[PDB]
Design a protein around this ligand. Sequence first.
Ligand SMILES: CCCCCCCCCCCCCCCCC[C@@H](O)O[C@H](CO[C@H](O)CCCCCCCCCCCCCCC)COP(=O)(O)OCC[N+](C)(C)C
Ligand SMILES: CCCCCCCC/C=C\CCCCCCCC(=O)O[C@H](COC(=O)CCCCCCC/C=C/CCCCCCCC)COP(=O)(O)OCCN
Lengths: 98, 114, 129, 347, 70, 83, 105, 71, 99, 303
Amino acid sequence: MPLVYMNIIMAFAIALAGLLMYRSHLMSSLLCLEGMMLSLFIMSTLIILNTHFTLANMMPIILLVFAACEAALGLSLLVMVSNTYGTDYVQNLNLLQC
Amino acid sequence: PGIVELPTLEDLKVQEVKVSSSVLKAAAHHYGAQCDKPNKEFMLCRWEEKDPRRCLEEGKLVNQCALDFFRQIKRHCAEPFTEYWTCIDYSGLQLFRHCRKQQAKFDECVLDKL
Amino acid sequence: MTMYIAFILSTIFVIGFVGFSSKPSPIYGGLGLIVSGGVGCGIVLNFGGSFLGLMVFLIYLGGMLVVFGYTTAMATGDWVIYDTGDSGFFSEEAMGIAALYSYGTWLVIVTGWSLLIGVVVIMEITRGN
Amino acid sequence: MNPIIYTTLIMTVMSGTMLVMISSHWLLIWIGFEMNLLAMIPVLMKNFNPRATEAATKYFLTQATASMMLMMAIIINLLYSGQWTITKMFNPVAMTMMTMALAMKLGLSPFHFWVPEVTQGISLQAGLLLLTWQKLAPLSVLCQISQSINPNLMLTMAMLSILIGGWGGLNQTQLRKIMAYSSIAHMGWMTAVLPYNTTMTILNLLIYITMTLAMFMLLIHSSATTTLSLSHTWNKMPVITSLMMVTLLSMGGLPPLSGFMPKWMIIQEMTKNESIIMPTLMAMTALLNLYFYMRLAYSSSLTMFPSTNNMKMKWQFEHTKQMKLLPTMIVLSTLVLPMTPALSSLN
Amino acid sequence: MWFEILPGIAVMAACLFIPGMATAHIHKFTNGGKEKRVAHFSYQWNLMERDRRISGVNRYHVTKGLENID
Amino acid sequence: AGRIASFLKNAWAKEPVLVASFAIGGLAIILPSLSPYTNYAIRINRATPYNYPVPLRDDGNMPDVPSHPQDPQGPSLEWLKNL
Amino acid sequence: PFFDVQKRLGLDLDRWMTIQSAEQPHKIPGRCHAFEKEWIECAHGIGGIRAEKECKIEFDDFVECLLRQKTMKRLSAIKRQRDKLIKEGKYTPPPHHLGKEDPRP
Amino acid sequence: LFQAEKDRRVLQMLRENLEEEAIIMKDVPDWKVGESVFHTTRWVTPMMGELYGLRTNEEILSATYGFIWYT
Amino acid sequence: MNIMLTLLTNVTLASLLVLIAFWLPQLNAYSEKRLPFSMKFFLVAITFLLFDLEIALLLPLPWASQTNNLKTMLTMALFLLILLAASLAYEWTQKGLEW
Amino acid sequence: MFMINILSLIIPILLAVAFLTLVERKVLGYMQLRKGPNVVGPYGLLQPIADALKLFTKEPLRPATSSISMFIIAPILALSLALTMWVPLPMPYPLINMNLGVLFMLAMSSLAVYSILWSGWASNSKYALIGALRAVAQTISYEVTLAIILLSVLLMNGSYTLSTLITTQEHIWMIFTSWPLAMMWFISTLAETNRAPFDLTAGPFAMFFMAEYANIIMMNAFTAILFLGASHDPHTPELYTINFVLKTLALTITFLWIRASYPRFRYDQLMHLLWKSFLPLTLALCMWHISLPIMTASIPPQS
Ligand SMILES: CCCCCCCCCCCCCCCCC[C@@H](O)O[C@H](CO[C@H](O)CCCCCCCCCCCCCCC)COP(=O)(O)OCC[N+](C)(C)C
Ligand SMILES: CCCCCCCC/C=C\CCCCCCCC(=O)O[C@H](COC(=O)CCCCCCC/C=C/CCCCCCCC)COP(=O)(O)OCCN
């Protein structure tokens, strides 16, 4: 497993870590999710092209589309959250508690 | 686990055909029509053995037959053929369509000659 | 060997990823993600994925991150593992992608249904009340 | 929302779950998970209020993170072996990655934090859907790859889930959070037997689904979301409270009721694999679940809490809409112990 | 009158004349007096590489005709 | 029958773009299934050689496979040239 | 769990995209087609545990074809030894490596 | 003809690499010259780094990215 | 390399021109003296994103036309476009394209 | 000699967009019963030089509170994209020959909105932010139908290669095969560049102006290649170059014609125009052009 794959998994790791740190600004959480998807697409495309798996060339497209769909969903939710509070801050979602 | 076996450099020595891609393209149809049998030997053996190390003799045979074909072409119609390949070389995509007139000459020459 | 161009591109990828992972000023995070996406599409293009890299550059950058920036503005080692043979008189990536309509009938059906349901769901959520 | 739209969304959720269940390609399983998540959000937000929106946002974030982790695991498994089929995982890193992904999807501890809040925010029907139907696809995926999972991580997370559910159920006054913690504990019980027997997992899943369906339908029939609001039901329909008390006793694993069937069998199978300490710990921990079920029974049926005058008008009305299969769910979740050996049907 | 617009337009035309024509001459100056060979699909690229190896001067456009067959 | 014709009239006025779009869509949907040249297009797609035709080893029991390209046996592409 | 609807109805909904050696368009082969074919033939109709204990050689060959860890390690060792020996100054590189030597079609 | 020339060229590069590896590894204790990394004896198509590994960087970059970068 | 060099040249020339434009007039001494969050624009952005995803799905058609499964490819492409038109119609009739 | 080729591609485009301002002014004046600039120079032939020097000598107004970073990035990106767009164009031989030239141009046009977005954000004004959001939404909305029309038209070409469009139109123009698509494409190109009737919105301003006008000439050249094909003789490319330049000039003069001939739309009016008249018809024509080669057995060759 070469060094470029190491770099891409490392980028995915930083994206996941940044998603889990949660300073504020849920939009940053969506950005971290979307960077995770971009890293997934990059690594999957590299794997598929290196091994010449022809029929697997569909898988990136599909994945991208689905993730982008999820992106829209998140944005919509974010907007509604903002409409309730005026800001997309993380701490404003403290109504429900354990 | 094991040692790979590779043929010696002497076994890969053969009189390579030394024409450009345009020259090969110009005579491609006659090359396929005339040199078909050794080419089919080589291709069938290559697709059956799945081993480059077991297909050297047929490669030498197809090179020899191609050399024979080009020697005949040079002997019989050097002038007609030269004009035709030259036209092909000029085109960026090496299109047959662009210079039909040259082809009519070469073909008839070959039809008269060989 | 241009000093491991793929390695340099990967390093810039990780650099942009850690730049936007600190989550400063979400517009700046989007800028870092733009740079990272461009670098990754460059990685794909240099590897040989012309159409998939151009899909990244078109879809991702021009629609998805553009919508992200729009909504934000609303608010406040290589060369060794490579191949040896040729592809023929075409490109394997394009044929594999275009085989979607011949082989991936199930994939097209499920993806189209998901897209239509997504449109419906977006309208449902954005209605409000 | 529009009844046609609601039916379409429900069918889309069920179709995504079925696609996960009947597919053999990893990308199709991921697509089914994405479809389920995409169609689940409006269902959680059918009744619009800030609570529902916040719960839906929490659920979406958790499920999107879990799906990203699952796709990363699939990509790693493909990288170390060019395979897309759902089989042996061929890699330990991919296995632990997708193990945590499925644990987060199922709400198993330590990924249990979202379950009580998402259940509390959404309505009773959406809570029923979330706690019953949304457990089939991840459990099916786990059952398909049970030979590759590391027993240590499975057992640790299952024991943590049971302990956390038992401890957290004690401090709750809201019934929906009680249901969420009960679901967490039962999920730990289901998961603790996956490395040994998936048939036990499926049997426990069926029993738990029947019990929680009966309990949720009883809670919908008597529109109560809190212990105090539930304490008033005896003055309008005591039969409902009596059936509820019997079902609550069953949910605690008390013999000869139905809830004793899974635990017993699970314990037996674990003792077949020379594991004695863990089943004992799980039983003594489920004692806490039984304790808070008994407290709810005390506050529900075995004693008569004070009532209100305005209940008299409620005496003059009958439920216009009646749920079907509720008697069947209660009977199945209470009195099917003598037909225990039927589990040989590989349910 | 209206033909007084023509001078500036002419300049524009001259400007738009320069790039493409220049490229053509460039492609004729660098590719041995012929069109620049296009290479998609990786087969004609192999043809160009073989021509470069055959020529002996490390230039693909130096064609070796029949006189090189001996 | 009168209601449908009246609806088509009312739609052709004050809504011509939608009428044209629906007409073109219906024609594009229905016409290919009854056009006789789709089989010709399929046959043309079959006739394009992208790969090398690998010959078969002879065993003296294949009278239909030609031994040389010029041999009369095998598929004939005269139909395409006549088009 | 797994409801094998495809095998019951003979549908082939998603089995065409599972493996490299399964009917690629235009007969384009995978990079490790033969290795995966051999592994599948070894492990077919035997079960999981027996496939893992008995078809270990085929899977090792397939994974080596996929990732080329051994080949890269050997090439890196050769490169390291040649670089060290050239730094010491006892080996002179051949003309073919230099690129001075003429190419063959 | 292109196929035949390709096999001959690839075999020649492999033979030269074997000769230089044998020259290079005369002194290392546990090495074996021209040893395969596969259990099987079937022919395996060599990688890009197997043929051009011991050659110059200019030809390495050519053989790797010539078709990709040619425009 | 050629595309890299072209991009580098364009970027360098643009940077030089902008730098000169911003600095040449800066050397001579001179005087040197909300909430609304409209939803319709967000909706149009979202539907643009969804239609862009469907366009991305539709893109490989020029190579999809040479497959020997002409009936299947034609049916699948017409199905994709029918679903696209259905999404547009659904957004139209539910008052989703209004101002 | 590649750098010389790049320079000989770049500089003439800058000179052409320099003199296009004078051509537009003179054409508008003569269409308005007056003259254009005819005093500074023999026929205003030195007017662009005077305007360039005057713009390059005038003080720039930094808002004193704006973010400098994106404020300076935006014109660089705009001008770089405008100059990069010309690269794949075959006239008749492209500087860089790409397989997916059309996809490259589409991706760069998609990138083009980022300059507008960043300039709007960096203005530090709510009104300018509203205007920028409005323009970005319009641009992406018309980009949708741009992409759909482009793919439906290329379905009769066989590939995304730009040079093959010359071979495709060897005998007939594609204006005859699909004039409705060309009509909608012309209107969409008018809409993308914020030109009349869709134009609802010193140094950096000058750079943005060059980017916009280079985009205009680019779009006219692309339309001319796409729909008004010329005959290319490999033994004389100058004929194709002259034909292409003349058609591009005709299309640009036509752009000035619609600018001088009509009033402008409202924003909701053009949004409704697109989403309720072009998109349905565009989808119908996309299905029609998908089915047409199959039903007539005239599928383009390359794959
Ligand atoms: C049997 C049960 C029916 C009721 C249950 C339905 C469940 C939900 C509906 C989805 C299931 C539909 C089955 C379609 C599976 C796709 C595969 C099958 O159709 O065969 C294909 C045939 O394709 C068909 O044309 C598919 C057309 C069906 C799609 C049209 C309508 C889609 C509606 C489905 C539901 C979508 C949402 C609701 C819409 C109203 C394969 O083509 P073929 O060429 O042999 O082989 C290709 C492989 N090669 C290349 C190696 C040779
Ligand atoms: C079966 C084939 C389907 C696929 C082909 C279609 C391709 C794409 C076309 C559809 C795109 C989206 C269409 C969305 C329809 C929206 C309908 C609607 O709600 O609009 C109404 C207006 O339109 C209607 O009244 C409903 C549709 C009217 C009928 C349209 C044509 C019906 C079919 C005609 C052709 C039939 C087939 C051809 C036969 C001709 C002979 C060959 C409201 O208008 P407002 O903008 O709100 O303004 C009102 C205030 N003044």
